[model samples]
Target chain A: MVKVAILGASGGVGQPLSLLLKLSPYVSELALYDIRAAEGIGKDLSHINTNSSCVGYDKDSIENTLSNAQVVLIPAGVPRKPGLTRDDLFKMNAGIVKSLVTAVGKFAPNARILVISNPVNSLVPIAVETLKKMGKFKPGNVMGVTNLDLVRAETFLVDYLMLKNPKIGQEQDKTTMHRKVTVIGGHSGETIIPIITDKSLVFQLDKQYEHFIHRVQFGGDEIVKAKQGAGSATLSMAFAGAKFAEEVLRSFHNEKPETESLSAFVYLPGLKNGKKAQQLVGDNSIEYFSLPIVLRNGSVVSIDTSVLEKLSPREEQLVNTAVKELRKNIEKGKSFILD
Target chain B: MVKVAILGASGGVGQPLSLLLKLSPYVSELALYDIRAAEGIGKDLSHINTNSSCVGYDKDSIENTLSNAQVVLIPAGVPRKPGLTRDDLFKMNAGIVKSLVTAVGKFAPNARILVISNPVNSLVPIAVETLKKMGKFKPGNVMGVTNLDLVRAETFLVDYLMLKNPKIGQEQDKTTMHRKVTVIGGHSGETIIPIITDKSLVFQLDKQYEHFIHRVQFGGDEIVKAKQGAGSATLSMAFAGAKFAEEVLRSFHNEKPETESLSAFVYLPGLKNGKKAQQLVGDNSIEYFSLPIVLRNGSVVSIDTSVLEKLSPREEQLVNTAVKELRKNIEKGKSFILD
Candidate 1:
């Protein structure tokens, strides 16, 4: 049994994400916090038949909401609209993350923080910085969610491959089994990288490879365009957030140590294999990057760079470009607080 | 593996309800339909790592969306705002339910239809009437979701009881185990009746019992007032819808036959024990009422009126008043289509 808190529980991502957490067998208590209407959302979630009991807290109850949370997921910021990039949300979300993390530092300093707010590349650093200022920083405890990138990659690739040839054998099993594609770099358009290598799965995209990569990198844009300015990627983002949260909760409960690895943006120096990962990318200057990391005891135990060993030439090229964009993104996030 | 369709998949209730359905292990395919933005919602849900595949369809593809669906959940209608009763939504949602159920009748005639639109007491009958007009009416196939009323009842009662006294043993176990409460009548304020007469767990409210009942019956008002105009009970309603959908799917898969009873507003004449239940309530004129139902092979096999055996005198009086209000509600729904 674990206690989880969701910041911005009334927003698009928060509502669905909180529902998923409420349904999680590992969650015993759920606290929902938002600027407004969180109490109602909490009341709504409590009515679910799941074992978890949920409570909603407004701004005044932020400390109350965070008090004993083992896992705190932040999906509490402005959403991306049509024609808007993740960076476009930095001005608002950066501040939001900072304030929330400050509260986390004060109330629930040890809780594992999963950052889902847009401009995650930046907001995550803001959280880390704020926690550091409050003397509550834990290197491996904060994660910037980029799991949606892997989700889209696996979905799009399996879908296309299945439609192309219905007779595919082990790959079909892999898809059904939730085999993960190695997604690295940051959680944005150019900064996102999906490494489609033979070791991960033996497949050829042929002419569809570029479009597949493009889709994985910019899948949010497709939804934004389709929505015609209403919202951006709430359902998918909630799915990804829940998926990551479950993994964290599982580690917290010591359920599955083997399958705890997930792709997330984290400070490289804080990881157990940080130096190796930094050398693999040949970029110690870039403080935070999204990579697959293993969790044990509710914190990142090691960074898994084994998937980086067999990247195809095209994937390697994409990584180089991704690193460049991610470098600037990291700087922007750091400057938001430091400068 | 079952195919489920959600009408109004982009609206407040539709979006969260579809998300829950998407996460269900029993659902293999999810079809989302709405007047607009369904494609975006579908696109978003598709990125989740769940086994279920989701597709969003527009008004033009209503037939396509409904085709071959084993379960069709309708949350497609305007939500209640402050100062509005479920009846206040009738002028709009009645027409909405009629149109959607007409499509369901034409396309997925055998699908179990769960109506979650506002004024469910009336809208459920509207669905039955529409299906009858199309010559595809099945007595046990259409259900009006009054599950939320029971959900609220069980949650609030358990919370209040558990907090009032620590010695409440079986009640605590019942709350944790999600043991059912006997809530009968209809889905609206005056028509809803929660019969809390279990001697195994004794607690006192003094003057609070009446207020508790009122809260259970009119809980949506609290949420609407809290939201201050945004929406009403979307999260809780989604939870209830998902719970009911899961039970229906469980029966569809022949998973659990023993514990499949739930409270829903359904056509009494369509049930196998319809006459027995009709006699128990002493109301042959009211065709639709929310009561415990047993499901087998995706159909209501019997109406369980065992809860009525021990109703207190006060509860009996409430039931009498409920039957009167419910009779008018049933007529309003049938007349919407037949007249």
Candidate 2:
């Protein structure tokens, strides 16, 4: 009842995410599950005297660790390497995510699930299908974390704005001048899109919009290149995973429901009602939708869409591509469950 | 039941400890409680993900966070700086530990308690007394973490041994070697003692034991000097704390009861009979012993001390001084609590 378990806990994203989770104050116990070296990782983390008991779960103890987990983060599955498309990652990660989802269904059925393994466009659907097959499916409990894209968008836009006024610190921007960018996309190259139409919000997006957009689209590649075959966007992805987990926890705890924003793979319009019904987006929704939504009582609330109206034609085209890929990914996941 | 709450969450030890706890796998809810920044800290960690719900608990929510915690680690109070003796630290930390123990008594009565606030010699007694006052005292459930001294001894000795053996390669000795060095003493300056005369099959007392003994006595000072005032042995201390905590978790989980080496303040045999009795050293006595002991079912089984028969006179003198100071510290804590 008081444990946080991380599946696929030994990967790039999992490791750093695990580290960040260890630092948190809300986590009472941390259980890390992975195929290898998880014990060592747990041991390494146990030295910190925070009010949490940290443990590592290997193949032998996954069930025990998963059973008590109220919130489970799955960062399992292979990451997209340099020169590989998210589709290429899906070829391997799809089966991985499906099997893991089945395991979660058996062990942590009641836990809130955050799927961090890539091909989120497809793998999240795979998880939903797996849960459905197991009769443990709850649309509200599963989440496809896409904060990396948002963080990338925000960071890139910040840098772009910083070019205009380097002195525009985060502190000043907090109260004085700030620009928010709405990013919508599949968590992959090209499919990921950033829409910044706000021109006079204290920071101009005109001059550096293209550069910022490119940065968001290929950020994973940047990590791959920097790692040069050693690792991927593990540290940053971990940060994103941590951010997403924190938001979910806040929503679950009912601590000022609007405290965090969520972007989940959910049933959206034209795909709900078993057909063309729209999937609802936000923390509170009957259907799945990925957007900037806030969590309330384990659900999401829709936020102001004034930001959505600022999308440029290029951005809209990118969003359309993302939706098309997302539809296909969802179909693939459903098919896997059906078969 | 699955939340992390950090006490003394703002100190040197607490900051890193909190960060590491946040990254742990067992934590599904993280609650940071300190005198300051509880809300902002919660907001900062919220971006991590919801695998564990996170919130910053101010003085008002301290009771709420502690109510359901499974484990509560206290690293609160002031820490020893360069050239400061543990006795000097005791004056401030003893009161701090007493107050925190009172909180734990009222809120997390069933939770496993780990005391990282130092002058552990005195503070642990203060805790026992406070818990006793609250009528929730359980000796087995409370522990003073003193692995720093053990790790320091092991690391320094291993490093020295590595220098002795040039061909084995630099940095070859590891904790796995189980090269046991029993440290017993007050947690500072002249009171710190390392008993190297334990002639066992595993580790032979070096002929140049004087150097080893001196190194163990002043290791903390060495770190302070090396840091040149930038930072203390904060990271190393954290590593030691984590190591000890993991062992505690392992023991709690019914894992193989591996022998764990540590140095801690506990109730002494003489004091066990009556409060003012003279301290009597024993292997793993719950009252007043900190050695390499086997842990199982929340009880410590002192390891065999047959090797102690071979100690040199100088080593015995060091042990004697440590015992005397430790006894005084223990009494000091008792008086603080009783008063």
Candidate 3:
């Protein structure tokens, strides 16, 4: 029974995420914000008979929507078209995140901000930089949502392993199984790293890891190309957004160790264990990466760097390359606000 | 853990509903069929790592998609454009439902068919006529999803009463309260009837009923008009579709009355207690109406006619109007195939 706000609430990702949150047991009031059709989307969702009171906000009410909001979900931005990298989205999406986060700075400065816009590599820094400039930066509040990357890693690994033994992935489609593998680094192609050797599944991540890594790194291209230029992923991304939001709500309300650890992209210097993650990267410039983090009091308290120790020499090479690209991505963003 | 097939699984409604079904715990294998982009939608959904094996099928394999499906959900067809009644959608959506249902008749004759297409008052009859022609009509199998209407009734009534005494609707936005009102007859404007006196809430079904009933019948127009022609009720409709599908799944899996009663539009003469409902209306020509249904063995075994027993005189007059319009709607539908 808390107030949650969704910016870009009428877009492909936002509308479905709006529905997901309205149906969420944790929410009692949902403020939906978008430049177009968001009020109508609000009108539509308000009719769902959930406990949440969904009211639509537009350009005129973005600040009003954010005021007193406990969590602000931003999935607002242009989608990737065919042949376009998530890096290509940096210019279009970075400004949108800055402006929205600026408003979040003024109104819901304390709100836990979940950024799902692309390129998350750059735009997440853009969000943090803008919030910092406004003196509203919270170490763990402005987190880039990389949940879809983890989801893709888990499911695609299942697909890869399923083809191998036929009975392995087929073994328990219904079980509360660990399809989870450790996916670190950034949220875009090449920079995205999935450490298959670290998973509980007792499979050797050898030559299979070669194809598996690239597929997980650039998995979104399949959807972008499959959509035939219609749009990039909306449904999958929305589920990821919803899945991540539930964890925050659960952790905040319970604020207990019994709650499980999850992953998100966070700024290193601002977080307690985030600096340790930077040390593990062997690069002073690599400041932000998605890693397993424990949550308490509604924000990341500490992160687990144990996955880095378990990484095979092959997996370590991927992280090394990820740090090189991530340094440039983060540099491009922090300067956008600093200048 | 059952197989479910969704026809038109790439459209606005289909896309969101695909997300819902993919997320459904009951679904093990899901086949998404559509004329366009369904494969992409399937690929996107398959990345979610649910127990459901999401697969896409196109024009070439609609039959294969339908093969061995326990539930075949059809939300195919064009949406209502501005200045157009659902009846205006009849020409475009009618043919779409007929063709899809015809394929169902051939491939999955025993599949439970739940229709969410527009002009459902008519499209449902077209589905029955086509199935009957193919010698595959199952009395309890073909159901027009009036769950959205029931959803609208409960929600709109809450909104209506919420505006009355400030504290009334404000009382418990969190409680699992009954905002349910009895909605019967056809699935369109005037043909739709709301029996306001039939609810558990103590309220006079007087002039207040006047505004409440019309709002419930035409609530979708708010979203259609709200969207300014982008789309209508996809998220809400998808939730309703998901909601109703859950009831059927639970009942079929358990085959017990422990499952609460739900509502759906069914062909009256074909159902066991449907004739009793038709007789209660005092209109022998009226063969279908949305009513409270008891499900067992995956389809409706009996319907509760008790909602009709408490109709006010004014409500009866509303019913009188409903029967007249519903007759023309059903007539236009049945003959669509009989000829």
Which pairs clash inside model 3? none
Candidate 1 stretches greater than 4 Å from native: A82-88, A169-180, A196-200, A204-211, A257-260, A310-314, B83-88, B169-180, B195-199, B202-215, B257-260, B309-315
Candidate 1 docking: what grade? medium
Off by over 4 Å in 3: A83-88, A173-180, A196-200, A204-207, A255-259, A337-339, B83-87, B166-182, B195-200, B204-210, B255-259, B310-314
Pairs in steric clash, model 1: none
* CAPRI docking class of candidate 2: incorrect
Chain A (alone) TM-scores for all candidate structures: 0.94, 0.83, 0.93
The Cα RMSD of model 2 versus the native structure comes to 18.4
**Arrange candidates by TM-score, highest first: which order?**
3, 1, 2
The local lDDT score (0 to 100) that residue B250 gets in candidate 1 is 85
Candidate 3 residue lDDT tens string, B35-113: 8888888988888867779999877899879889989899888866566665556878888998999898889999899
Candidate 2 deviant stretches above 4 angstroms:
A81-88, A165-179, A201-203, A257-261, A269-289, A299-314, A332-339, B1-339
On DockQ, the candidate that comes out on top is 3
Model 3 C-alpha lDDT per residue in residues A195-219, reported as the tens digit of each score: 7543445354435767778888887
> Candidate 2 on A35-118: residue-level lDDT in tens?
875665665555443445677777777797788688889999886555666566676788878877787888889887888988
Least accurate stretch of 10 residues (summed lDDT) in model 3 chain B?
A: B172-181
